[PDB]
Design a protein around this ligand. Structure first.
Ligand SMILES: [Zn+2]
Ligand SMILES: [Zn+2]
Ligand SMILES: [Zn+2]
Lengths: 49, 44, 48, 49, 64, 49, 49, 252
């Protein structure tokens, strides 16, 4: 991620030259369910957290 | 003060104050140009 | 040369500046030695 | 034959191609001298400068 | 990386024989036959071409 | 022989447990306060990275 | 045993061969320096003093 | 301090670390220069509060992949504001979030208040409140944001080609120069400019898509786009290839 925040693929040579870490973003699908003892259940999923 | 872009190899004059970046490429790795001064090598 | 009363620290000596120097780091920001920091704590409590 | 005198060496010398390697250890990387150098301020003892 | 100009042992010119040596090998010459065709009699000079690795060729695969 | 994978898997579970512990702590503060919590804000990305 | 200069695991090298590039090598040393603006008072920059 | 030469500029020597008379040779000071160090060749509440605030700053930064230099700049701002103590009443999280916003502005890569809010539990309203207070306390200022300060992040986040980003930057700057959108927020203009350029290329992004990344309601994008739509041929760069002709751009 550049200073402006623009993502770009990181080549291994650029990581070597610019002293970066060759890392891949990790995302996880998270499903959240909430119960409020009111015989209603709300299930909201946050894809790729 | 010429810097050569590592991606497109564009020579661009860059001031000390302004940010270091390829004018047209946008690349962020810059190489200094070879000195114009003359250095002698003995072929030994 | 030694007395039992002298074992009790009534007056605390202060090491010279040569023993504990003022290191310079990040420019003119004098980095006091660990002894100075303890000495600073000692004097603060002593005055209090 | 002796290079200095050109006379045949009495013994016949085992000579042939052998694969040799130059090792990273150079003498220039190792030679170092000290003569009234930059002592430490706190310890008043020698240190690298 | 590139063929030495001189044989190390004797100083014979070897820098103008790598291209010919490769051409001779492409002509189905054996390595020994090619060296003899190139005038390399002393095994010190034959060593120069028989054991040369031309890394300059792959170094040119990287754009300047 | 513990190669890169199994060695990395050893770290990930410790670091993932901290991540799950951290979201539990973050959520508990908001749930006790009475207000729902934002999942994106609960996750501390620096733990794994 | 030519002149006694190869004794005790020492080697006599041909100076003429060395003159021709025999075991000549390059040594590359890379130096990295970064300018940090941490601290409002101090702001280090690249320029010839 | 050569005894023979009063007021003489002694020359530092790295051989032994001593200062020598510039024109005597006399060594004044045996080895006092300390060559190696010189030439490169139970927590307090204030401290603990700063510790937690610094932890929050780093946590916020990783959410939007900010470089450590901005984090360091934010930490310096927090120390100044925290030590000045004009915002003692305000929550440290709000102060840190406002400091993060200022640090981004001071580095030439502004993030909109919504972008900072999305990474902080503090609402945008409270960040703005602490933002203005911090400027007063520090007696500092931030250069006004422009439309081009967000084109790189927005276009990159929208997976738009470089040419679309270049056209989007040109359209937004020209619209401001022509005063086609007086009083409109730069972010609204940037989103509308991106929409116009995006609609004119193969990679077309809906109004909703640009709003989500830009944080601007599609209604707001619609209003700004309507103002610049009439002058579409003039705003587009001269050397621009139109997948969809300018005359056939969406009208709304
Ligand atoms: Zn370039
Ligand atoms: Zn030869
Ligand atoms: Zn003098």
């Amino acid at each position: 991620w550049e200073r402006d925040g623009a993502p770009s693929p990181m080549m291994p040579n650029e990581a070597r030259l610019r002293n970066l870490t060759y890392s891949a973003p990790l995302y996880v699908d998270i499903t959240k369910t909430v119960i409020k003892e009111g015989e209603e259940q709300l299930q909201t999923q946050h894809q790729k957290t | 003060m010429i810097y050569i872009c590592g991606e497109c190899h564009t020579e661009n004059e860059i001031k000390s104050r302004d940010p270091i970046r390829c004018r047209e490429c946008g690349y962020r790795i810059m190489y200094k140009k070879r000195t114009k001064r003359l250095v002698v090598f003995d072929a030994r | 040369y030694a007395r039992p009363e002298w074992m009790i620290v009534t007056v605390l000596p202060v090491p010279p500046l040569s023993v504990r120097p003022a290191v310079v780091m990040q420019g003119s920001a004098r980095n006091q030695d660990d002894l100075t920091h303890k000495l600073a704590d000692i004097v603060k409590i002593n005055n209090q | 034959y002796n290079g200095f005198t050109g006379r045949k060496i009495t013994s016949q010398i085992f000579i042939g191609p052998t694969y040799y390697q130059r090792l990273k250890h150079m003498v220039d990387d190792k030679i170092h001298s000290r003569a009234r150098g930059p002592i430490q301020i706190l310890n008043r003892q020698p240190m690298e400068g | 990386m590139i063929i030495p100009v001189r044989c190390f042992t004797c100083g014979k010119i070897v820098g103008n024989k790598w291209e010919a040596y490769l051409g001779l090998l492409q002509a189905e010459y054996t390595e020994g036959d090619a060296l003899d065709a190139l005038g390399l009699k002393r095994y010190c000079c034959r060593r120069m071409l028989l054991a040369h690795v031309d890394l300059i060729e792959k170094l040119l695969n990287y754009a300047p | 022989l513990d190669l890169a994978g199994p060695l990395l898997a050893f770290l990930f579970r410790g670091m993932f447990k901290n991540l799950l512990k951290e979201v539990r702590i973050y959520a508990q503060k908001f749930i006790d306060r009475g207000k729902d919590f934002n999942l994106e804000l609960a996750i501390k990305t620096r733990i794994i990275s | 045993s030519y002149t006694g200069y190869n004794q005790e695991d020492s080697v006599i090298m041909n100076r003429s061969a060395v003159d021709r590039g025999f075991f000549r090598s390059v040594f590359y040393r890379s130096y990295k320096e970064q300018e940090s603006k941490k601290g409002f008072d101090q702001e280090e920059v690249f320029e010839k003093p | 301090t050569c005894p023979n030469h009063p007021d003489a500029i002694l020359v530092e020597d790295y051989r032994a670390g001593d200062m020598i008379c510039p024109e005597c040779g006399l060594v004044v000071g045996d080895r006092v220069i300390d060559v190696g160090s010189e030439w490169r060749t139970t927590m307090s509440s204030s401290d603990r509060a700063m510790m937690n605030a610094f932890k929050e700053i780093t946590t916020m930064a990783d959410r939007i992949n900010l470089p450590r230099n901005i984090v360091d700049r934010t930490n310096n701002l927090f120390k100044q504001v925290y030590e000045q103590k004009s915002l003692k009443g305000r929550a440290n999280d709000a102060i840190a979030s406002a400091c993060l916003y200022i640090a981004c502005r001071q580095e030439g890569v502004p993030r909109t208040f919504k972008e900072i809010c999305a990474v902080s539990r503090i609402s945008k309203k409270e960040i703005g409140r602490c933002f203005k207070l911090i400027l007063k306390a520090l007696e500092t200022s931030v250069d006004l944001i422009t439309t081009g300060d967000f084109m790189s992040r927005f276009c990159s986040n929208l997976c738009l080609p470089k040419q679309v980003q270049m056209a989007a930057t040109h359209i937004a700057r020209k619209a401001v120069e022509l005063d086609l959108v007086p009083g409109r927020s730069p972010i609204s203009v940037a989103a509308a400019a991106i929409y116009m350029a995006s609609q004119a290329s193969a990679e077309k992004r809906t109004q909703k898509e640009i709003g989500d990344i830009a944080g601007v309601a599609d209604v707001t994008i619609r209003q700004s786009y309507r103002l610049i739509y009439p002058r579409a041929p003039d705003l587009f760069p001269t050397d621009f290839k139109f997948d969809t002709p300018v005359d056939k751009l969406p009208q709304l």
